[PDB]
């Protein structure tokens, strides 16, 4: 039979299953909604483990319950009691024998210890993954260090001094490849002469490179603390959410970038290199599977000053135009090629954030906290647990690193990059459209001819790279 | 076959924007929603008597990708214009949507509407009237919705379907 | 894409976390952190196919050892490490084969024979003890360093084009 269980009196996780604190969905079961208990006694299972359940849940609980309140839970959820001697173990002791005690061993071996240890496990999960709790409340990390470092017994102690020294790792808190990366690339620009570096004077698969590395790095720096509750949306984002902040400013300065680069070069034979060389790096950023930077520039593409540009569009090479376009389609029917695609490349990759912020936002605005059944409120998990899946996808692409040597001079020639310089949003992208207008008048108006800005080569030295010995 | 409108829906972020698309599109009763669904922004409606489909576009949650707007904007043939009636910030905001809307789509009458939403029941700010005003002075309809009841959900996009139509 | 669920087992300390952090992260773990469960994804192409593994890493600490029926029956293929410089560790290799084959109540279940540390150079379990136990499997070995990488992709591919292939 099954192992009888203490009394829900004096522990609460025993109470039995209903459908007043646990609704499954439709070969573990998944879980729709429960009581804080019911998925806290699900979440450190004695049948089974849920490593899913368990990032879900150490992403998403905030909005359920609190810190400090969900250590107190898992801490009354560890101290389970034992049951006392039966009939047989009675007998036994009352002829001076050693009783069998098998039911209690049973219980020990079949109930308490997997639950301890999946309490722990949610403690080193919390603890290595979730850190920022205990980063913002000294006196929750204070609590775990005392929880931790007073269990006793010898069936847990490997996993409690470890997670102690976990802890007091991450109290204080290196890449290997398959191959070396391919050597950098230079063109007009030499290295060490910074003062040179501009869109047609460094090596435009350089330019790629490092703004992918750039890209890259700003991408697997968001964490999931910062996306759950939409606090990027919130009043506090600036706070919240600094990573994915700088993140989108970076892509915002780099389309701008490539708007003002366009549209300040008057010359409409330069102006044609300028784009050429743009697309270009577009090609690269393709190559490269930086889905960001691709995007970047076809949002500069489909800008308002850019795209009525049709002398400088009639000038663009077929191919160019061609790879433009297939860039284009991959948003098009709400990103649907895009979404396809990043599906199916082998990474590393850069993704677009966007598209993972409209759907976490949705999700948390379309479904309810809670569901009413039986007169109780029941938290809705599947909610959450649609959250969750969207941070997942998120942290799985942030684990693989690219194998591309970072120029350390190009790498901050981009950080630095300031294209709207001290003007406002409004004036400076005002200024953009009526460059645009006066590089190419809206029609009657005739085409003026502009002088040459540009003193050096214009011919791109091409996207496939090169390697001497 | 059937008339196909793509709506774009603009407006200020961190004020329950998102309801607007939720509340259409949704299981009307049920409150419910999977925006990852291939078609979770797709709805056949018959306005007037007539079948269309709307294909409805919300970035809600981009608004910092500030350069995409005119990516975004392109796209669409009708906008919803939609500002929080409890944050004047976001009203003050709609006249640069609307000279955005203008200039990307290189048209003076552009089909659009101006939805004032209820997301909350924090205080007012916005009074009606300061929104029709501003909607007259446009010469666009004004409509305000519920981000919790569905009051002028279907209103919105009808009204903007029905601007299109006249056009 | 289609999703492989692959499983790593094997005594405490042989390198299942290190080997499964190699491969995901490109990063070599020096600490021995006993694992309870962790679970990991990595999206990639193998033989021109794109997947998606999900890799739960085990614990081999012999006080977990009552708690191994229930992820032997989620997964798919397994991955059966020892370490080449510890002897116990390669004859607990049996006991965790066993144990999947009861679990799954099958002969013939995906596995890879796995002798990792190979960076090491005071071997103590030679190949080609390992690889006549792996034949008797009906399996491949493949020799790793979670250190260095070396066989570390070749392992977990391996284990997936078994997969593919049951
Ligand atoms: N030299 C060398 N050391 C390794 C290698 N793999 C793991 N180690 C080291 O061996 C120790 C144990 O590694 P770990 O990955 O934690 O082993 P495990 O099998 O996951 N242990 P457990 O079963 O308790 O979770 C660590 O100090 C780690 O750095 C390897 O290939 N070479
Ligand atoms: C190659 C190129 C395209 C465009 C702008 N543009 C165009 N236009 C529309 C208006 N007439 C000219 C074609 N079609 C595009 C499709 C996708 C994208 Cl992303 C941008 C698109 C503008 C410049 C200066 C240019 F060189
Ligand atoms: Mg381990
Ligand atoms: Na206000």
């Known amino acids: 039979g099954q192992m009888r269980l203490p009394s829900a009196d004096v ?38 483990a849920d490593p899913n359940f368990v990032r879900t849940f150490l992403t998403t609980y905030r909005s359920f319950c609190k810190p400090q309140e969900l250590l107190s839970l898992i801490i009354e959820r560890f101290e389970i009691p034992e049951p006392e001697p039966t009939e047989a173990d009675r007998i036994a002791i009352e002829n001076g024998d050693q009783p069998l005690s098998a039911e209690l061993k049973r219980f020990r071996k079949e109930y308490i210890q997997p639950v301890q240890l999946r309490v722990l496990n949610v403690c080193r999960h919390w603890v290595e993954h979730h850190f920022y709790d205990f980063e913002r409340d000294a006196y929750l990390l204070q609590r775990m260090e005392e929880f931790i470092g007073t269990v006793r017994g010898k069936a847990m102690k490997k996993w409690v001094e470890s997670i102690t020294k976990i802890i007091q790792r991450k109290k204080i808190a290196n890449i290997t490849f398959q191959s070396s990366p391919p050597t950098v690339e230079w063109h007009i620009s030499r290295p060490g002469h910074i003062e040179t570096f501009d869109l047609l004077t460094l090596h435009p698969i350089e330019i790629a490179r490092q703004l992918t590395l750039l890209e890259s790095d700003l991408y697997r720096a968001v964490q999931p603390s910062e996306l759950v509750g939409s606090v990027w949306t919130k009043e506090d984002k600036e706070i919240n959410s600094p990573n994915l902040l700088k993140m989108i400013r970076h892509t915002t300065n780099l389309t701008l970038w490539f708007e003002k680069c366009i549209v300040e070069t008057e010359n409409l034979e330069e102006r044609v290199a300028v784009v050429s060389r743009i697309i270009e790096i577009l090609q690269v950023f393709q190559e490269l599977n930086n889905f960001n930077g691709v995007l970047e520039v076809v949002s500069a593409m489909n800008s308002s000053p850019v795209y009525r540009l049709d002398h400088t569009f009639e000038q663009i090479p077929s191919r160019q135009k061609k790879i433009l376009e297939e860039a284009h389609e991959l948003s098009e029917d709400h990103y649907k090629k895009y979404l396809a695609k990043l599906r199916s490349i082998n990474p590393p990759c850069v993704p677009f954030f966007g598209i993972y912020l409209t759907n976490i936002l949705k999700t948390e605005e379309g479904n309810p906290e809670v569901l009413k059944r039986h007169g109780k409120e029941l938290i809705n998990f599947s909610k959450r647990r649609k959250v969750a899946e969207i941070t997942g996808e998120i942290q799985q692409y942030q684990n693989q690193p690219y194998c591309l040597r970072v120029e350390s001079d190009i790498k901050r020639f981009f950080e630095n990059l300031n294209p709207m310089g001290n003007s406002m949003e409004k004036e400076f992208t005002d200024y953009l459209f009526n460059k645009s207008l006066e590089i190419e008048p809206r029609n009657p108006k005739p085409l003026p001819r502009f002088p040459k800005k540009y003193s050096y080569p214009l011919k791109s030295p091409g996207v496939r790279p090169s390697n001497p010995r | 076959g059937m008339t196909e409108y793509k709506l774009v829906v603009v407006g200020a972020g961190g004020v329950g924007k998102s309801a607007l698309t939720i509340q259409l599109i949704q299981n009307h009763f049920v409150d419910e929603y999977d925006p990852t669904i291939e078609d979770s922004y797709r709805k056949q409606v018959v306005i007037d008597g007539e079948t269309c489909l709307l294909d409805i576009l919300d970035t809600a949650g981009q608004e910092e990708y500030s350069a995409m707007r005119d990516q975004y904007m392109r796209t669409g043939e009708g906008f919803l214009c939609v500002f929080a009636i409890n944050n004047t910030k976001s009203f003050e905001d709609i006249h640069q949507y609307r000279e955005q809307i203008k200039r990307v789509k290189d048209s003076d009458d552009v089909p659009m509407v101006l939805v004032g939403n209820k997301c909350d029941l924090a205080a007012r700010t916005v009074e009606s009237r300061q929104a029709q005003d501003l909607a007259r002075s446009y010469g666009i309809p004004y409509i305000e919705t519920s981000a919790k009841t569905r009051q002028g959900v279907e209103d919105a996009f009808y009204t903007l379907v029905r601007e299109i139509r006249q056009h």
């Open chain 1, 11 to 48: 522990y609460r996780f025993a109470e039995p299953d209903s459908e007043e604190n646990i609704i499954f969905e439709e070969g573990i079961p998944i879980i729709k909604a429960g009581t804080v208990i019911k998925l806290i006694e699900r979440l450190t299972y004695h049948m089974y």
